[PDB]
Design an enzyme around this catalytic site. Structure first.
Site, mmCIF file in Angstrom:
data_model
loop_
_atom_site.group_PDB
_atom_site.id
_atom_site.type_symbol
_atom_site.label_atom_id
_atom_site.label_comp_id
_atom_site.label_asym_id
_atom_site.label_seq_id
_atom_site.Cartn_x
_atom_site.Cartn_y
_atom_site.Cartn_z
ATOM 1 N N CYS A 289 6.186 43.295 76.619
ATOM 2 C CA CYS A 289 7.110 42.164 76.495
ATOM 3 C C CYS A 289 7.816 42.203 75.139
ATOM 4 O O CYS A 289 9.048 42.089 75.046
ATOM 5 C CB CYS A 289 6.346 40.816 76.656
ATOM 6 S SG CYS A 289 4.827 40.706 75.706
ATOM 7 N N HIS B 96 3.322 34.772 69.265
ATOM 8 C CA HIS B 96 3.165 35.101 70.674
ATOM 9 C C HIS B 96 2.276 34.079 71.380
ATOM 10 O O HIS B 96 1.241 33.677 70.857
ATOM 11 C CB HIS B 96 2.538 36.483 70.827
ATOM 12 C CG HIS B 96 2.762 37.112 72.169
ATOM 13 N ND1 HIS B 96 2.108 36.694 73.309
ATOM 14 C CD2 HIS B 96 3.547 38.153 72.542
ATOM 15 C CE1 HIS B 96 2.490 37.442 74.328
ATOM 16 N NE2 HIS B 96 3.364 38.333 73.891
HETATM 17 N N1 LIG Z 1 0.798 38.351 79.823
HETATM 18 C C1 LIG Z 1 1.842 38.829 79.252
HETATM 19 O O1 LIG Z 1 2.540 38.170 78.575
HETATM 20 C C2 LIG Z 1 2.096 40.315 79.343
HETATM 21 C C3 LIG Z 1 3.379 40.736 79.039
HETATM 22 C C4 LIG Z 1 3.708 42.078 79.139
HETATM 23 C C5 LIG Z 1 2.779 42.969 79.547
HETATM 24 N N2 LIG Z 1 1.544 42.554 79.861
HETATM 25 C C6 LIG Z 1 0.611 43.609 80.287
HETATM 26 O O2 LIG Z 1 0.472 43.551 81.676
HETATM 27 C C7 LIG Z 1 -0.873 43.921 82.032
HETATM 28 C C8 LIG Z 1 -1.534 42.793 82.765
HETATM 29 O O3 LIG Z 1 -1.565 41.635 81.928
HETATM 30 P P1 LIG Z 1 -1.770 40.191 82.534
HETATM 31 O O4 LIG Z 1 -1.340 39.248 81.515
HETATM 32 O O5 LIG Z 1 -1.254 40.133 83.880
HETATM 33 O O6 LIG Z 1 -3.339 40.107 82.681
HETATM 34 P P2 LIG Z 1 -4.253 39.344 83.712
HETATM 35 O O7 LIG Z 1 -5.479 39.345 83.157
HETATM 36 O O8 LIG Z 1 -3.674 38.182 83.973
HETATM 37 O O9 LIG Z 1 -4.159 40.336 84.975
HETATM 38 C C9 LIG Z 1 -5.011 41.449 85.237
HETATM 39 C C10 LIG Z 1 -5.536 41.336 86.646
HETATM 40 O O10 LIG Z 1 -6.135 42.580 87.066
HETATM 41 C C11 LIG Z 1 -7.348 42.315 87.719
HETATM 42 N N3 LIG Z 1 -8.235 43.477 87.583
HETATM 43 C C12 LIG Z 1 -9.136 43.700 86.582
HETATM 44 N N4 LIG Z 1 -9.792 44.824 86.688
HETATM 45 C C13 LIG Z 1 -9.285 45.388 87.845
HETATM 46 C C14 LIG Z 1 -9.581 46.581 88.534
HETATM 47 N N5 LIG Z 1 -10.361 47.530 88.052
HETATM 48 N N6 LIG Z 1 -8.970 46.792 89.706
HETATM 49 C C15 LIG Z 1 -8.078 45.912 90.123
HETATM 50 N N7 LIG Z 1 -7.684 44.781 89.542
HETATM 51 C C16 LIG Z 1 -8.331 44.566 88.411
HETATM 52 C C17 LIG Z 1 -7.874 41.027 87.061
HETATM 53 O O11 LIG Z 1 -8.804 40.400 87.909
HETATM 54 C C18 LIG Z 1 -6.573 40.231 86.884
HETATM 55 O O12 LIG Z 1 -6.230 39.435 88.001
HETATM 56 C C19 LIG Z 1 -1.558 44.284 80.724
HETATM 57 O O13 LIG Z 1 -1.385 45.649 80.403
HETATM 58 C C20 LIG Z 1 -0.776 43.458 79.711
HETATM 59 O O14 LIG Z 1 -0.749 43.979 78.395
HETATM 60 C C21 LIG Z 1 1.180 41.265 79.762
#
Ligand SMILES: NC(=O)c1ccc[n+]([C@@H]2O[C@H](COP(=O)([O-])OP(=O)(O)OC[C@H]3O[C@@H](n4cnc5c(N)ncnc54)[C@H](O)[C@@H]3O)[C@@H](O)[C@H]2O)c1
Ligand SMILES: NC(=O)c1ccc[n+]([C@@H]2O[C@H](COP(=O)([O-])OP(=O)(O)OC[C@H]3O[C@@H](n4cnc5c(N)ncnc54)[C@H](O)[C@@H]3O)[C@@H](O)[C@H]2O)c1
Ligand SMILES: NC(=O)c1ccc[n+]([C@@H]2O[C@H](COP(=O)([O-])OP(=O)(O)OC[C@H]3O[C@@H](n4cnc5c(N)ncnc54)[C@H](O)[C@@H]3O)[C@@H](O)[C@H]2O)c1
Lengths: 331, 333, 332, 332
Positions: free
Chosen positions: D149, D176
């Site tokens: 992001c 953030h």
């Molecule tokens: N939240 C933000 O603002 C943001 C922004 C940009 C990028 N990201 C990136 O996106 C990615 C996800 O972040 P998020 O905020 O959605 O996190 P989150 O925790 O909300 O989502 C991760 C999901 O994956 C699931 N999960 C965990 N282990 C797993 C496995 N082995 N198999 C399948 N599913 C599994 C979890 O249960 C959860 O629902 C990360 O790399 C994060 O850095 C997040």
């Protein structure tokens, strides 16, 4: 119908918003507050809770311009408001300062035909809750109150219970969103010491007359209900927790069916019935007065129950203000 | 008495804090968690809610070193692999929040512990105790015991005072409860309670609680006479019980206040506290009582139907009760 | 020294708290505020951020009573009716946030020996920061300012940098706790529209003069610094984020050594140096003006650095108020 | 194009929301996560930050059913995911667990043609930012990253500055919103001790590689930018605070004009330009990568500036993932 909004706070601004969100004869001719109209226009267009609105709206020469031009006023005292000249049918009295029938009647002296107080009133001002007793309104009632957000959540549920089962006694708690009377850091709130303590650091007990106010709209329940509040760190949406002893034996299922039937018939657009796994944020923007949470309630036995009903204390109440304005006024 | 702390979380760490604050004779032989001792020592010394503690404490040679106390760190997720036999463990403080059934918890006994104290309600044939209410019912044969929940520790002392003075016909309780570690910072999955995974600091969140039925366990006269529910709200600590109660005898709100005040001065000393001050939740951060009756907050409908308000620091009050129960077990086994 | 506190808000109450926590020879004789003394006593004893204090304190006989300390409560809105002559007042602590030297001199007109403004001042008010320039205080300065919380955090760090490396230019951000000027839900704030938006729903940009004000106590830095703030949803503790271009080549590590040495010597009890994995709540109750966060900062190259310094904007500033009061008492 | 979502968290669910919101030709054939599909459906329909969505959506027969869309729910180890049986064109890798190239390649081994990592990657993963370098995508790139992001906010601004004025050096802070890696109360986070401290009690320093990733997308800037982050107690929306030393003299107003012009032309739908008194909540649901806040920035002199750019780190990023998927669909 020509209205003015006195006090452009959460309720005043959202009353204007809800007016704009329906097909309505209401004409908002003026807004009065203690700050300049460009700032008021900004607050109307950008809302931390309910998101942006009216992107085309602009301020110019003391008018809110939307296509509609609304005069901005900034006049401290009622004797100086131009309600005669503006041909005002109803003042929406939403400052939170004028609840006395003597203070508010000065709106009528300066030329307004009627006043609607967006709060519980002091004295015996006729008080209405849509779907509960609004048909008691009499055109001779030139000063009226829409009660509180909390009374608008509790009274419809209480009416369903009264009509189906009878109520012996009830004690209500509302877990209530923080509001503009509170403070960001610990400060003085003369008439409520706890209410000055940091709003987002604390669960804060508060007194409330909303449960007693149900007796104003449902006379059978006078003396049968009281309650209290806890203010908590969310910016909007509140919930009524009603512990009630019913007058006849029933089941939780029968209560759910009674509420679901009322929401489909006599309480349409006022009460809503859900079985979803809801939390407070799910009701941001909710226009119902009372959303019965079937999954959250509990039954001790066939006469003693704890019922849960949600309300967006900002948008639900503002929508009811608009509903009452449309109901009471002529043409 | 030799104890280990299994799960060095909010409760495990604050149990250790309260052990150290009373210079207790209990010997904390080992601490188990899913991470290494340098991180755990950091979390013990620095606490967002309760402030810094034990500035001289250090992580050294795989142990937490605090004066004459040197505590071994373990990081073994599997209970069947814990060295409780070799460490000669008298009591396991089971504070992971994962082991709730009696047979899951008994695995600690299989690995060599003499006794387990679960810092939570348990399922099965587990005695549940509340200090000041029924803890003298403890029997040395109780090799797995529960200190109930924080909420039960607030409601049960109040319920006992009401039972003893006026009788209780029926009660319906709500707890407005601080967010806890079972919740999520942003909307996420919570397998056993979907609402419980919604963003903790964005929401009022309805939750189920067994605390009302558990009062019927500690006070058998109240079986079937109480139930209740909870709302999780966006504060990091301190919770409040809202008890709507129909009493057996006619009384006044003032007489209830006097009964609670008298109990706090006598039979409930150090368990219940009575205040008339204009309190809010943050006023109880660090409070060690189980139940603080808020005299100004309650309301009366009539001479038998009342809504009573009682505060509790769900972290520090409960941790202090864990230490109280441990010392009681040490003196009666 | 006989002082009065005008304005019993976060700063006024916590200044009284710090005077008492260090059982100081400052004698607090009166508190003036437009709220009754029973409520003000309540707010002094119960604090959501800093915990309870002075449990034995009562509002009694129109006073705040704490042991042998008895403090008169006043509720006087006109600065000329203040009984500073009859109370034999040495210093007025002016912490209302409302009082431009012309208005503040009226405290001396009503009989006080000297005034200390707990905020930046407009006009011919000397501005002092403990550990940076507080020795410029002269007994002839009858109206003085302690600057802001933020200036008290930035200036000590800036002085260490100037003395060891020189500063070419700096741009500061303070990520700042919510304060009493903010609103719980969206409301109007005349001179700061963003500042009226719900304080705990928002990151809120704000203007700040703290960086330009460092040029008052370090004239060497006039025109070399400016900055801005983001107000965020914490109730207390703030952090300075200083992006600075130094006048000589150095290493990050050497910056840490300069700061640590200063914290051990000339900045003792003013600046603190840490290498711990700290977060804001760790500084609730912290009395230092500026705590350098060694692990948090970054270096782009040998002249361009981003440095991080924490401050309890309530308790650190209140403690500096008390320190300046005691200094003024020893050299007056 | 047939995609699956691995990890149905904030990013995974909002990617699906943004696909449905624009009635996209992308076909979402499966969702994998560690919990049952009825709970995942609930979380997709009810969102504390972004409101309710897809009211007619239901869980039925182990699938998410939305009209003609039928999405298989899986709860599975990357080794046995049925990408071969599902004819998967792209895995949206959004678990936050698989960041290194060889872990992620197990998706290709299980039968997927391509992987899109919703995070900065480790290894030789090409990284793309829409509006900055996405046209460098090559059909041979079978594992790609959409960066973070923060990088999606910073890189467009940095490109506008580079193209109009040149950048000598920059140090960035992002204030953030809290994210799912954080904790409600103090808990352990092995790879980031500070990151486990109570998310809504604290300002929390954090490391970020976003500034260095901008050097990946804009090689002219390799080595000229670094930065850091503060996690603060809001549930969504973040802001980049960029302190930059430009290569040519300019004015703040000229920066504003350059950004406004880019937002109307080359950065259309990527950057937005505002002069309003905005706060973070004003960007909830904002789909732009970077919103330039003209009133918030400050200039020290004609070469050294502090620029402020907002981003909905959930919805803006999710929208960019969909944009990149559609771009890959049109160029593969
Ligand atoms: N939240 C933000 O603002 C943001 C922004 C940009 C990028 N990201 C990136 O996106 C990615 C996800 O972040 P998020 O905020 O959605 O996190 P989150 O925790 O909300 O989502 C991760 C999901 O994956 C699931 N999960 C965990 N282990 C797993 C496995 N082995 N198999 C399948 N599913 C599994 C979890 O249960 C959860 O629902 C990360 O790399 C994060 O850095 C997040
Ligand atoms: N917020 C809710 O949830 C809620 C629910 C039900 C009822 N209400 C009632 O609505 C009323 C307004 O509440 P609110 O939440 O909008 O508060 P608010 O503080 O948001 O609004 C009050 C507004 O009136 C302005 N004002 C103050 N004094 C004035 C004066 N003398 N003349 C003109 N304008 C003046 C203020 O500057 C402000 O803009 C209250 O009486 C409240 O009890 C509010
Ligand atoms: N927080 C409260 O208010 C409260 C009050 C009363 C009782 N409790 C109960 O106490 C228990 C702990 O709650 P908490 O709030 O401290 O939770 P927590 O999450 O803070 O603590 C749990 C700890 O256990 C660790 N852990 C997890 N799995 C483990 C394993 N396999 N082996 C070893 N360590 C492991 C975690 O890393 C964490 O440090 C729960 O049963 C909870 O219901 C909590």
């Amino acid at each position: 119908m020509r209205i003015v909004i006195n006090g452009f706070g959460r309720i005043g601004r959202l009353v204007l918003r809800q007016i704009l969100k329906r097909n309505s004869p209401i004409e908002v001719v003026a807004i009065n507050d203690l700050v300049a109209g460009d700032l008021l226009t900004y607050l109307f267009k950008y809302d931390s809770t309910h998101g942006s609105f009216a992107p085309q709206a602009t301020f110019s020469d003391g008018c809110l311009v939307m296509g509609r031009k609304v005069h901005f006023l900034a006049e401290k005292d009622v004797q100086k408001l131009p309600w005669k000249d503006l041909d005002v049918d109803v003042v929406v009295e939403s400052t939170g300062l004028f609840v006395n029938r003597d203070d508010v009647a000065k709106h009528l002296d300066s030329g307004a035909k009627r006043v609607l107080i967006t709060a519980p009133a002091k004295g015996d001002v006729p008080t209405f809750v849509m779907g509960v007793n609004h048909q008691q309104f009499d055109p001779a009632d030139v000063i009226i109150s829409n009660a509180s957000c909390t009374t608008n959540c509790l009274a419809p549920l209480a009416k369903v219970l009264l009509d189906n089962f009878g109520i012996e006694e009830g004690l209500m708690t509302t877990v209530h969103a923080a509001t503009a009377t509170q403070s960001v850091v610990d400060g003085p709130s003369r008439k409520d010491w706890r209410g000055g303590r940091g709003a987002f650091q604390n669960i804060i007990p508060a007194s409330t007359g909303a449960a007693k106010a149900v007796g104003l709209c449902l006379p059978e329940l006078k003396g049968k209900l009281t309650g209290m509040a806890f203010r908590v760190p969310v910016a909007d949406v509140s919930v009524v927790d009603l512990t009630v002893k019913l007058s006849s034996a029933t089941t939780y299922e029968a209560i759910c069916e009674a509420v679901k039937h009322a929401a489909n018939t006599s309480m349409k657009n006022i009460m809503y019935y859900t079985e979803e796994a809801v939390v407070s944020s799910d009701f941001i923007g909710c226009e119902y007065s009372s959303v019965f949470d079937a999954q959250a309630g509990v039954a001790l036995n066939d006469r003693f129950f704890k019922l849960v009903a949600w309300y967006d204390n900002e948008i639900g109440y503002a929508t009811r203000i608009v509903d009452l304005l449309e109901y009471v006024q002529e043409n």
